Design a protein around this nucleic acid. Structure first.
Length: 50
RNA sequence: UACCUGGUUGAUCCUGCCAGUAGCAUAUGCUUGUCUCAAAGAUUAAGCCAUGCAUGUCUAAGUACGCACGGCCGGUACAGUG
């Protein structure tokens, strides 16, 4: 199940302003940037072993 | 600039100190137009202190769900400034 769907968005409301629905930034989530950071560390292990 | 002068005697030559003489540091008195640099609560009390200030800090890169903002797009997890 993708946790991106189940984030409880905050239903803001105020006068003279367009409707707003804020959601928090999920922390400790596996993303293509996170995976590339583990690949970089493994590559440096190869470099200083060669 | 490697310098002396007055004072003991009726007069003399000495010993010897007193006073004079020049700088330099603190205080003080009188006087003071221009211009440059410039010390300044050490001395006595390392005594006592009203009040204000003298130490804070964010980049692309630790953590943003403050609508606090003008503004995107609207199922976009997080647009940005903060």
């Amino acid at each position: 199940d993708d946790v991106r769907q189940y984030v409880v968005r905050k239903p803001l409301n105020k006068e003279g302003k367009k409707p707003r629905t804020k959601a928090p930034k999920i922390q400790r989530l596996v993303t293509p940037r996170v995976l590339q950071h583990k690949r970089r560390r493994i590559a440096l292990k190869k470099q200083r072993t060669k």
